């Protein structure tokens, strides 16, 4: 079969709508998420029109093989979606209403700069390619767009699911392409990380500062403190970066871990300095420890104040 | 083909039933589990009635392609289930009895607040969408609901598998939808975790208390004890939280590990205090150790008493 | 097509047989294994009989779509098997011999109580559901049961592949079901674990005992020994249990690791005691070390004797 | 159907083109990447010519099963691509223009010698096998080659996507084969590794040098420093090499880690030497530390200068 | 359709040949590898002969459904291969030449005794089952066997790809089976492991020997050295064995790691002995250190000489 003829020289618009049923498997490392939703299309094929009075039927349903149906494709997807046609109902005037349920693995990049205080805008791009008989354009039926109430992305807050009404039509390989942009905005729930990374870092800084209260003569103890806290800092750094894709930039968590490492390494340099001035000039070492015991936790407290105040 | 005509203006009810055959792959992190069971439907299509005398057959079986069959779908599923039709038998009055065997990956959220002493209610949602010719409603055939005796969840105890008789009918994209809620209740077997996390934590607290009995002059020894116990606590915490999804709340295990970390870090602060009072005021330090050796294991024992008494 | 008519009122028996061709991917954690074997069925459909003299052919082969074939299904399998029909040959009397080659992921629970000295009985459950025209029963053709010589389960010794002749017939959803039990018995090869887990534990106990021979005055050294051996014990314990499913009970390896941890922690308590009696009553501490140096390795040797003697 | 007849004795050329739509899952360890793009073919089958006036259509489109289509296969692919035919348009002269959208897992080796400062040229090899009736040759339609602007490799910069016009024709199993070479050039974004590995190594070298400023009499402290830095170096080496395939050569990161290990182990040998000359010849040890404190960081700075200057 | 009739009473031989196109994903742990190659068959079905003069065609091509084709199966494969028929050309005398392109996951056991200096012989087993009308036997057409030059196993050197000409015929379930053995011999590239495991082990032995040059009075330092090197050895052992399947035997790497562990633990026993003889009989301890400093690195050098000389 072939596309319906134009009543003049006008483009055929397909009213689209997506209703999210299930939303799962948001992969930060793969920058993909799995979706299972309704796809609804609606166009006008006057060849299928009929008299509502002579025909005692009010709708009349067809099978996908019976009538022409537009080839609608997703762009930012890994494999072609798995779709099951739910219903096809033509109107007495020829208005075809098509409804399927599909599942797909969507590939949408994420911006981890404000991670884990980041919000994302996942994109689902519909697209249709014009035929030689007629140009096809996509539209948005807001009545057919939405998401179920029990849709959940564990670890995220789902903000909204909308669509950009004005489609992007463009030339591609000598044919017209019409693209729609469905947008799922979310905001990450950072609490999980506060006890996953932020607490080990803060407690490691505190543990490193405890060394300033040990006697300056007991070198091995303070050495254990400093060294173990520095290595612990490095381990937390790598471990934390192992959850993200190979992004080139640095996240907010990256900055917090970096400042913590600065404090711990500062405690190391301090321990080395004091140990260097212990035999000769014991007054200097005593002053260094005495001042550090007040400055370190103070600067650290101010830092946490500015940080959590900023990212919350 | 199209749905059977209403004998007046009455909804077509489809009597459903699920019989769990196999139950496996309950993923705590993905909050999904794989199910393999029987799906049984039963309705009345008077068009299929027949004379039991003229027709020498008492039942008569059809092929799925021959007669109208309702489109029954699962909601909380990742992909459309894989089903093999087992049998289709019509009654002389037109009562179609349909039986298939399906396997599906069900997506059901979990509540880890009482983890690992938690009980869960896995949900399997049936749903059918009404056609324009007639509304379809779902029902539950208690005779067709159940589960095999050899159904096992390697880490769980299976409590029961029932279904909510009253379906949830609602409007979706201008059509009526009927949803049924099958519930599989389970309770986790916590023993695995007692030796996976709880024992390492308790033994780390005890090991941390062993430092109080070492001579106050041998500083490096007590330093090794305290530091290693604190780092061990941090590692056990992270490792333990790595088994769950990025939930925002805290589990019971989270509380136990948190209190253990409180005891260990308290032992650290104690070591720092005593080391600070060792040269000047040795009597004070001696009092500190003497009291700690009795308070720490006592408060810890009381805590374990309240905790294990509460969560069991 | 429909099932062959009963020559009176007798059940139709299908002679079954499985020939293991390939056996791989035995997953201890998933309690599943992958199989690839021959499935052979044989029944009597007198409608297919023919004259061996008038018909110059001795066998005559059909296509699956041509004749009725019983719907045979596996029970303890995750998805429907992937089968390729190999041959279908009818006899002059109507004896259909059907042969396919299938691969399936079988789900069979394991008993890790004697792990890693455990033996298992993997189960493959065949089943057939009776039709309304005739009851179908399963049988076992010992001539068609077996396994290839080059079948290997890396890390296991394959003992036998047999079948329980008497099938389990029972009522299910108002129809008769016939179940057969094929059993693949295997015994694990424990050597891999002796150098994977048992050696690290034994060597850790020895290393812990080495501290008793260090001078009682060098406290930090003995502290390092004891602490590192205890942490090593915990790490080996958790690491070892990470290979099994979340079973509630304890394995033999669990017992060995537990006794090792008891010896190491006992060495810790000993170090604390001696360090506590070093200044006052040095004779007591000296006696403690002197006795431990002989008692610890002796009790440990006896333990290994009873253990390896028992589980070997 | 069979290939179109040659208008004389000429090979049939198929004008090919790939338009990258999606590019993802570039696996360094598997040396594979997943691609999703348009494949466009174009040939001349005069048997399909038609009158544009008698036939009221100006192009008129067919189904894949209707007309002869050349068997085009990818070479460096793991499984046969999953393709959905988008359009087939014939011209009045018989010019078939074919368009599909495919996804495939391409297998292209990588050169990690300059890793992570490496650039790669991923290859996609098309091929067609000539039939006995006519030889088939592949060509490149530059109008049909390109890639979408929103194509992204989460860890790479995409340089260009071109194709080698002149195909490689050769004999294979007594038939002619024509191969085309599409090339996607990329350059890795190394920043991720600077904070993933390079910083831990640099900070570990610095931390190892901090030991030279500790008193020569406090042996245990310097021991802790040296040992922990050496073990940290080894762990970072192994961990770093765990990201690449089992390549036989050494990467640039391998060289950086190797020099760092040389500096750290050199600090170990230095500590051993000084500790050996501390009691006898204290002036010598003092000279050793005094010189090392200036030589080590200087040679390290020069090394970093030459290295980062070279690889950037 | 049915097999071609025998011109007398002779077996039908099918000339087979495999041409490796792609070879990848050699999994040492799973003992499987993925292959993608050409499969070429050639037999004689006299029913298809034709006159080359009356028929104006020189070859004439058929569809798989048109003519009888032998059921060729792989044995040591996990799932049935995915094959796409490339060409079918019959000769005027009836010689059918069949060509497909397949991909399959081959399962072949490996011998890790000489690992990582091991060479393997991967097996691909063809097999055909004789029908009741005629016995079928497999043969090898050397013209159709080979492999592309750009075939690579990222961690191996590919030696050759040949086939055993004489097939293995045997009885199976009352029918004749013919099996062919294609052999791909390879030799592992061990360099990756020299810097992955061998270097950490050697440097850890050296690090353990460094303790002999430290003063006998600084007990804690030597304790740190010995303990850390022993634990490092154990970790390298387990980590190394984690790359192989649960084999019961020991590899060459296993032996090297074992000897290294013997040297390190010997250094531990030495430190304990000297520490035991430090106060009383200091001359004995001094002699122990003096001799060890020369014997240990010498015995280690001799060992490395014999080892690397043997396995290379
Ligand atoms: C106190 C006065 C007398 C001298 C202080 C000099 C230091 C403050 C300088 C010398 C080395 C510098 C460090 C060089 C490297 C790093 C590593 C970097 O840490 C990380 O690895 C980040 C990890 C991550 O982001 O996940 C943070 C900055 C820091 C500590 C620098 C902070 C500033 C340091 C410690
Ligand atoms: C009032 C001045 C003079 C003394 C202040 C001392 C405090 C800074 C110390 C005493 C008790 C310590 C607390 C003891 C226990 C913990 C629980 C710990 O929580 C966890 O580790 C959670 C782990 C998990 O969630 O798995 C966070 C640090 C904290 C609050 C410690 C932070 C440091 C505290 C508050
Ligand atoms: C305090 C003095 C006066 C008497 C000595 C008492 C000790 C012999 C007790 C105190 C704590 C007890 C320990 C408490 C808990 C356990 C854990 C238990 O299980 C495990 O270690 C886990 C092993 C596994 O499951 O794989 C082994 C015995 C052990 C170490 C106990 C051994 C006996 C211990 C050391
Ligand atoms: C300077 C003179 C007076 C005494 C030299 C004694 C040591 C400093 C020498 C003896 C053995 C040498 C080692 C022999 C082999 C190597 C392996 C080499 O390989 C790597 O670390 C590669 C790391 C990677 O591939 O990622 C690093 C240098 C090192 C340790 C050498 C460093 C210098 C060592 C320790
Ligand atoms: C002479 C007696 C009175 C006191 C000293 C005895 C030790 C020197 C003996 C007792 C146990 C023996 C150990 C038994 C087993 C092994 C394991 C072996 O290495 C391994 O098996 C590690 C596993 C691997 O290589 O994969 C190295 C020698 C060693 C430590 C032996 C070294 C010699 C040991 C320590
Ligand atoms: C995190 C930082 O970067 C700060 C926070 C507190 C600061 C320290 C406070 C007190 C002193 C004592 C002084 O000794 S003196 O008698 O020679 O003047 C030398 C400088 C020193 C060690 C400061 C160095 C910088 C800090 C570590
Ligand atoms: C989990 C907790 O937080 C508890 C567990 C055990 C408790 C300690 C038991 C004994 C003492 C000695 C007493 O005397 S003093 O001369 O140091 O002031 C001061 C209080 C102090 C340090 C308790 C503080 C609170 C704990 C750390
Ligand atoms: C695994 C075990 O449970 C055994 C292994 C070795 C045993 C110890 C050997 C030596 C002594 C010294 C003796 O000292 S006394 O003068 O106070 O009586 C008290 C008893 C004590 C601590 C034994 C207790 C039990 C063991 C810890
Ligand atoms: C990267 C390297 O490998 C260099 C960097 C600094 C160098 C050291 C500087 C000073 C001295 C003191 C001298 O002692 S002496 O009084 O006997 O001459 C002996 C040589 C020694 C240990 C050098 C050895 C080589 C280095 C470790
Ligand atoms: C790898 C090994 O196992 C060997 C390699 C070198 C050997 C050592 C060489 C020298 C001596 C001195 C001698 O002292 S004595 O005055 O009592 O005789 C006692 C024995 C002792 C410690 C040897 C023990 C065994 C070794 C550690
Ligand atoms: Cl799609
Ligand atoms: Cl479904
Ligand atoms: Cl099955
Ligand atoms: Cl392909
Ligand atoms: Cl196959």
Q: How far apart are CA E115 and CA E198, in angstroms?
A: 13
Among A144, A140, A108, residue whose Cα is nearest residue A124: A108
Rg (CA), chain C: 31
Contact: D107, E24; criterion CB under 8 Å: yes
Question: Is C304 buried (19+), middle (13-18) or exposed (0-12) by CB count in 10 A?
Answer: middle
Contact B167, B178 (CB under 8 A): yes
Quickly count: other Cβ atoms within 10 Å of residue B29's Cβ. Answer: 12
* Residue C240 beta carbon below 6 angstroms from any ligand 3 atom: no
Among B100, B110, B138, residue whose Cα is nearest residue B21: B100
Residue A275: phi, psi to the nearest 5?
Answer: -60, -30
Mutation pick from A15, A20, A24 vs chain B, by most beta carbons of B within 10 Å, is A24
Sign of the CA dihedral with A50 first, then A56, A62, and A66 last: negative
**Contact list, B246 vs chain A (CB under 8 Å):** 154-155, 189, 192
Residue A113: phi, psi to the nearest 5?
Answer: -60, -40
**SS3 sequence, C255-275?**
HHHHHHHHHHHHHHHHHHHHH
Q: Which residue has the tokens 């569809």?
A: E63
Contact A225, A208 (CB under 8 A): yes
Contacting subunits of B (3+ beta carbon pairs below 8 A): A, C
Distance of CA D311 to the CA centre of its chain: 18
CA distance E22 to chain D (A): 7
Q: How far apart are CA A171 and CA E262, in angstroms?
A: 72
Q: How far apart are CA B42 and CA B70, in angstroms?
A: 10
Contact E76, E211 (CB under 8 A): no
**SS3 sequence, B18-68?**
EEEEEEEEEECCCCEEEEEEEEEEEEECHHHCCCCCCCCCCCCECCCCCCC
Contact B109, B175 (CB under 8 A): no
Phi-psi region of E25 (alpha: psi -120 to 50; beta: other; left: phi over 0): left
Q: How far apart are CA A95 and CA A203, in angstroms?
A: 66
Quickly count: other Cβ atoms within 10 Å of residue D306's Cβ. Answer: 10
CA triple C230-C234-C240, angle to 5 deg: 140
**Contact list, B196 vs chain C (CB under 8 Å):** 238, 241
CA atoms lying within 13 Å on the CB side of residue D23: 25
Q: How far apart are CA D28 and CA D311, in angstroms?
A: 20
Among A220, C312, E261, residue whose Cα is nearest residue D219: A220
Q: How far apart are CA E250 and CA D88, in angstroms?
A: 61
**Contact list, A215 vs chain B (CB under 8 Å):** 219, 275, 278-279
Contact A190, A116 (CB under 8 A): yes
CA triple B218-B222-B224, angle to 5 deg: 115
Residue D86: phi, psi to the nearest 5?
Answer: -95, -45
- Which residues are near ligand 11, the ion (C-beta closer than 5 Å)? A 73-74, 80-81
Q: How far apart are CA D194 and CA D304, in angstroms?
A: 13
β-pairing, A12-27 vs A136-140, is parallel
CA distances from C57 to B121, C72, E133 (A): 62, 29, 9
Write the residue in B224, B238, B248 that is nearest to A200 by C-beta: B238
Write the residue in B196, B214, B218 that is nearest to C241 by C-beta: B196
Q: How far apart are CA A128 and CA E151, in angstroms?
A: 40
Among A1, A12, A296, A16, residue whose Cα is nearest residue A164: A16
Among C105, C128, C108, residue whose Cα is nearest residue C35: C105
- Burial string for B226-258 (b: 16+ CB within 10 Å, else e) reads bbbbbbbbbbbbbebbebbebbeebbbbbebbe
Write the residue in A77, A265, A276 that is nearest to D213 by C-beta: A276
CATH among 3.30.310.50, 3.40.50.720, 3.30.70.3460, 1.20.58.390 for B193-312: 1.20.58.390
DSSP state letter for B78? S
CA distances from D85 to A209, D64, D88, E72 (A): 66, 8, 8, 31
Instruction: Supply D157's token pair.
Output: 């910069």
Nearest residue (CA) to ligand 5, atom 4:
E269
Contact: E61, D132; criterion CB under 8 Å: yes
**Contact list, D189 vs chain A (CB under 8 Å):** 246, 248
Q: Is A68 helix (H, G, I), strand (E, B) or coil?
A: coil
Instruction: Supply D301's token pair.
Output: 């700075």
Report the residue count for chain E: 312
Contacting subunits of D (3+ beta carbon pairs below 8 A): A, E
Contact: E78, C22; criterion CB under 8 Å: yes
Q: Which residue has the tokens 């109580």?
A: C113
β-pairing, C72-74 vs B146-147, is unpaired
Instruction: Supply B39's token pair.
Output: 């799906």
Contact D95, D73 (CB under 8 A): no
B34, β-bridge pairs: B24, B105
Q: Is B79 helix (H, G, I), strand (E, B) or coil?
A: coil
* Residue B237 beta carbon below 6 angstroms from any ligand 2 atom: yes
DSSP state letter for A190? T
Distance of CA E282 to the CA centre of its chain: 56
Q: How far apart are CA B52 and CA B48, in angstroms?
A: 12
Q: Is A36 helix (H, G, I), strand (E, B) or coil?
A: strand
DSSP state letter for A61? B
Contact C35, C106 (CB under 8 A): yes
* Residue B262 beta carbon below 6 angstroms from any ligand 7 atom: yes
Torsion of CA C1, C84, E135, C139, to 10 degrees: -60
Q: Do domains E1-192 and E193-312 have the same CATH topology?
A: no
CA atoms lying within 13 Å on the CB side of residue B209: 20
* Ligand 1 centroid from CA E223, angstroms: 32
Using the atom order of ligand 2, give the atom closest to the CA of residue A206.
33
Q: Which of E211, E271, E292 to mutate to test the pocket of ligand 10 (most atoms within 8 A of CB)?
A: E292
Q: Is D84 helix (H, G, I), strand (E, B) or coil?
A: strand
Write the residue in A22, A218, A225 that is nearest to B107 by C-beta: A22
Q: Which residue has the tokens 């915990």?
A: C234
Instruction: Supply E143's token pair.
Output: 């013209």
- CATH number for the domain formed by residue range(s) C1-192: 2.70.170.10
Quickly count: other Cβ atoms within 10 Å of residue B72's Cβ. Answer: 22
Greatest pairwise CA separation for chain C in angstroms: 112
Instruction: Supply D59's token pair.
Output: 């192009």
- Which residues are near ligand 15, the ion (C-beta closer than 5 Å)? E 73-74, 80-81
* Residue B80 beta carbon below 6 angstroms from any ligand 2 atom: no
Among B199, B193, B202, residue whose Cα is nearest residue B259: B202
Q: How far apart are CA B36 and CA B21, in angstroms?
A: 6
Phi-psi region of C257 (alpha: psi -120 to 50; beta: other; left: phi over 0): alpha
Contact E5, E71 (CB under 8 A): no
Written as one string, the DSSP assignment of B126-181 is EEEE--SS--EEEEE-GGG-EE-TT--BTTEEEEEEEE-SS-EEEEETTEEEEEEE
H or E element, residue D172: strand D156-172
The domain spans of chain E are: 1-192, 193-312
Contact C140, C16 (CB under 8 A): yes
Contact A164, A29 (CB under 8 A): no
DSSP state letter for D197? I
Q: How was this structure determined?
A: X-ray
Instruction: Supply B282's token pair.
Output: 């040795």
Nearest residue (CA) to ligand 3, atom 31:
C262
Among B185, B81, B170, residue whose Cα is nearest residue B128: B170
Contacting subunits of C (3+ beta carbon pairs below 8 A): B, E
Q: How far apart are CA E245 and CA C249, in angstroms?
A: 26
Residue E105: phi, psi to the nearest 5?
Answer: -100, 100
Contact A127, A121 (CB under 8 A): no
CA distance B7 to chain C (A): 29
Quickly count: other Cβ atoms within 10 Å of residue D18's Cβ. Answer: 23
Between the two ends of chain B, the Cα-to-Cα distance in Å is: 57
CA triple B192-B195-B197, angle to 5 deg: 95
Nearest residue (CA) to ligand 10, atom 10:
E291
**Contact list, B192 vs chain C (CB under 8 Å):** 241, 246-248
Sign of the CA dihedral with A190 first, then A194, A197, and A198 last: positive
Q: How far apart are CA C83 and CA C76, in angstroms?
A: 16
**SS3 sequence, chain C?**
CCCCCCCCCCCEEEEEEEEEEEEEEEECCCCEEEEEEEEEEEEECHHHCCCCCCCCCCCCECCCCCCCCCCEEECCECCCCEEEEEEEEECCCCEEEEEEEEEEEEECCCCCCCCCCCEEEEEEEEEEECCCCCCEEEEECHHHCEECCCCCCCCEEEEEEEEEEEEEEEEECCEEEEEEEEEEEEEECCHHHHHHHHHHHHHHHHHHHHHHHCCCCCHHHHHHHHHHHHHHHHHHHHHHHCCCCCCCCCCHHHHHHHHHHHHHHHHHHHHHHHHHCCCCCHHHHHHHHHHHHHHHHHHHHHHHHHHHHHHC
Contact B76, B125 (CB under 8 A): yes
Residue D205: phi, psi to the nearest 5?
Answer: -65, -45
Q: What's the resolution in A? A: 3.1
CA distance E241 to chain C (A): 7
**Contact list, A61 vs chain B (CB under 8 Å):** 2, 131-132
Instruction: Supply B4's token pair.
Output: 């059977």
Q: How far apart are CA D307 and CA D312, in angstroms?
A: 8
C137, β-bridge pairs: C13
Contact: D220, E225; criterion CB under 8 Å: no
Instruction: Supply B168's token pair.
Output: 């949830």
Q: How far apart are CA B14 and CA B69, in angstroms?
A: 10
Q: Is D69 helix (H, G, I), strand (E, B) or coil?
A: coil
Residue E77: phi, psi to the nearest 5?
Answer: -130, 150
Q: How far apart are CA D221 and CA D210, in angstroms?
A: 11
Write the residue in D75, D234, D246 that is nearest to E203 by C-beta: D234
CA distance D27 to chain E (A): 13
Q: How far apart are CA A272 and CA A278, in angstroms?
A: 10
Contact C163, C145 (CB under 8 A): yes
Sign of the CA dihedral with B215 first, then B216, B221, and B223 last: positive
Question: To 10 degrees, what angle do helices A282-311 and A252-276 make?
Answer: 170
The residues near A235 (Cβ < 8 Å, ≥ 6 apart) are none
Among B223, B272, D216, B271, residue whose Cα is nearest residue A221: B223
Using the atom order of ligand 10, give the atom closest to the CA of residue E273.
22
Instruction: Supply C283's token pair.
Output: 């004779």
Contact E226, E208 (CB under 8 A): yes
H or E element, residue B278: none
* Ligand 13 centroid from CA C183, angstroms: 17
Among B44, B20, B34, residue whose Cα is nearest residue C172: B20
Question: To 10 degrees, what angle do helices B282-310 and B252-276 make?
Answer: 170
Q: Cis before residue D116, ω within 30 degrees of 0?
A: yes
Between the two ends of chain D, the Cα-to-Cα distance in Å is: 57
The residues near D48 (Cβ < 8 Å, ≥ 6 apart) are D67, D90, D94, D96
Question: To 10 degrees, what angle do helices C282-311 and C199-209 make?
Answer: 160
Quickly count: other Cβ atoms within 10 Å of residue E54's Cβ. Answer: 6
Rg (CA), chain E: 31
CA distance D278 to chain E (A): 10
* Ligand 10 centroid from CA E267, angstroms: 10
**Contact list, D249 vs chain E (CB under 8 Å):** 191
Written as one string, the DSSP assignment of chain E is --PPPPSSS--EEEEEEEEEEEEEEEETTTTEEEEEEEEEEEEE-GGG---TTTS--SS-B--TTTS----EEESSBSS--EEEEEEEEE-TT-EEEEEEEEEEEEE-----TTTTS-EEEEEEEEEEE--SS--EEEEE-GGG-EE-TT--BTTEEEEEEEE-SS-EEEEETTEEEEEEEEEEEEEE--HHHIIIIIHHHHHHHHHHHGGGGS-TT-HHHHHHHHHHHHHHHHHHHHHHHTTS---SS--HHHHHHHHHHHHHHHHHHHHHHHHHTSSS-HHHHHHHHHHHHHHHHHHHHHHHHHHHHH--
Q: How far apart are CA C41 and CA C64, in angstroms?
A: 13
* Residue B48 beta carbon below 6 angstroms from any ligand 7 atom: no
Using the atom order of ligand 8, give the atom closest to the CA of residue C262.
1
* Residue A115 beta carbon below 6 angstroms from any ligand 1 atom: no
Distance of CA B239 to the CA centre of its chain: 21
Contact: C22, E231; criterion CB under 8 Å: no
Using the atom order of ligand 8, give the atom closest to the CA of residue C266.
27
Q: Which residue has the tokens 């058929």?
A: E62
β-pairing, C72-74 vs C119-129, is antiparallel
Distance of CA E46 to the CA centre of its chain: 42
Distance of CA E303 to the CA centre of its chain: 28
Nearest residue (CA) to ligand 9, atom 16:
D284
Contact B272, B292 (CB under 8 A): no
Q: Is D251 helix (H, G, I), strand (E, B) or coil?
A: coil
The residues near A57 (Cβ < 8 Å, ≥ 6 apart) are none
Rg (CA), chain B: 31
**Contact list, D19 vs chain A (CB under 8 Å):** 172-173
């Amino acid at each position: 079969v072939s596309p319906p003829p134009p009543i003049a020289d006008e483009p055929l618009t397909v009213n689209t709508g997506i209703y999210l049923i299930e939303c799962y498997s948001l992969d930060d490392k793969a920058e993909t998420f799995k979706v299972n939703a309704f796809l609804s299309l609606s166009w006008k094929d006057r060849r299928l029109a009929f008299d509502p009075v002579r025909s005692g039927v009010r709708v009349k349903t067809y099978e996908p093989e019976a009538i022409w149906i537009p080839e609608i494709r997703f762009v930012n997807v890994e494999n072609a979606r798995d779709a099951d046609v739910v219903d096809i109902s033509v109107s007495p005037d020829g208005t075809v209403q098509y409804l399927e349920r599909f599942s797909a693995r969507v590939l949408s990049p994420l911006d981890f700069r404000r991670y884990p205080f980041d919000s994302q805008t996942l994109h689902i791009y519909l697209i249709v390619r014009s035929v030689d008989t007629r140009n096809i354009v996509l539209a948005v039926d807001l009545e057919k767009v939405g998401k179920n109430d029990d849709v959940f992305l564990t670890g995220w807050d789902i903000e909204s699911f909308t669509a950009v009404v004005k489609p992007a039509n463009f030339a591609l390989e000598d044919r017209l392409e019409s693209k729609l942009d469905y947008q799922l905005r979310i905001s990450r729930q950072y609490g999980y990380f506060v006890i996953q990374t932020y607490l080990p870092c803060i407690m490691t800084v505190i543990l490193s500062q405890v060394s300033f209260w040990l006697n300056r003569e007991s070198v091995p103890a303070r050495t254990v403190f400093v060294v173990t806290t520095v290595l612990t800092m490095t381990t937390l750094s790598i471990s934390a970066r192992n959850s993200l894709p190979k992004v080139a930039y640095a996240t907010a968590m990256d900055w917090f871990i970096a400042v913590c490492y600065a404090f711990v390494f500062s405690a190391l340099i301090e321990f080395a300095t004091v140990n260097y001035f212990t035999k000769s000039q014991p007054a200097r070492a005593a002053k260094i420890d005495r001042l550090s015991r007040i400055a370190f936790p103070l600067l650290f407290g101010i830092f946490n104040l500015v940080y959590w105040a900023t990212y919350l």
